[PDB]
């Protein structure tokens, strides 16, 4: 690893600098180096890891969607043949995206998940595993698409089970997990009713737990609840 010679603390410090500079590829390489030191990650360090890769893969996914829409338009009735370039470049972006997903999944599997015993870390990493299998599923088209989908489902479900037993309904990780598993149901698993049921039940159960919270915790929870509401308004 190109980060093997740098101190763990320096990698974390530089990941925070990269965040401030919106250099998310750098931020992700720094946090990968930090994970590969072999020590567990703190709460703040897990957030740095997730934010870095979320932004890297988020830009790749947006580019892939632009290119895939061009590709699909080029295969409509009446489109002039333009050669293999659109497909080639879509494939190039797709392959780079899959490489990032594989790298994150490899960090989770070696060895973040197996050492995560507290609910907040275990649920967090299983949500990530679900998320990156979901991004693979968004571009999948071959023999293993169903297994990719089921891997996303399985990881989200284990995280859901732990979060329901071990975290209050307003916990931001629990809420963000439910938000994304709902999106998975809606547009990956062809289960819009499940997506709507999960978003509503999650929102209503958080609502009823807000009275237990401090002002700051209230703000943290309501922010993600509003994203659940946004999706319900879009989907109904």
């Amino acid at each position: 690893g190109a980060m093997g010679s740098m101190e763990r603390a320096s990698l974390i410090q530089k990941a925070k600098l990269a965040e401030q500079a919106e250099r998310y590829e750098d931020m992700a390489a720094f946090m990968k180096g930090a994970v590969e030191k072999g020590e567990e990650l703190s709460c703040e360090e897990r957030n740095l890891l997730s934010v870095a890769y979320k932004n890297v893969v988020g830009g790749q996914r947006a580019a892939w969607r632009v290119l895939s829409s061009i590709e699909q338009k080029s295969n409509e009735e009446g489109s002039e043949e333009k050669g293999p370039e659109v497909r080639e470049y879509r494939e190039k972006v797709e392959t780079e995206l899959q490489g990032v997903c594989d790298t994150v999944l490899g960090l989770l599997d070696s060895h973040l998940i197996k050492e995560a015993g507290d609910a907040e870390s275990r649920v967090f990493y299983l949500k990530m595993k679900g998320d990156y299998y979901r991004y693979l599923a968004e571009v999948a088209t071959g023999d293993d698409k169903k297994r990719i989908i089921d891997s996303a489902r399985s990881a989200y479900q284990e995280a859901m089970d732990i979060s329901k037993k071990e975290m209050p309904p307003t916990n931001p990780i629990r809420l963000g997990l439910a938000l994304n598993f709902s999106v998975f149901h809606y547009e990956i698993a062809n289960s819009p009713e499940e997506a709507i049921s999960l978003a509503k039940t999650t929102f209503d159960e958080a609502m009823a737990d807000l009275h237990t919270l401090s002002e700051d915790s209230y703000k943290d929870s309501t922010l993600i609840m509003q994203l659940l509401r946004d999706n319900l308004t879009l989907w109904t």
Binding site: L179, V183, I224, L227, N231
Partner: peptide, 6 residues
Amino acid sequence: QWRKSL
């Protein structure tokens, strides 16, 4: 709107 994920 693009649906929300986190």
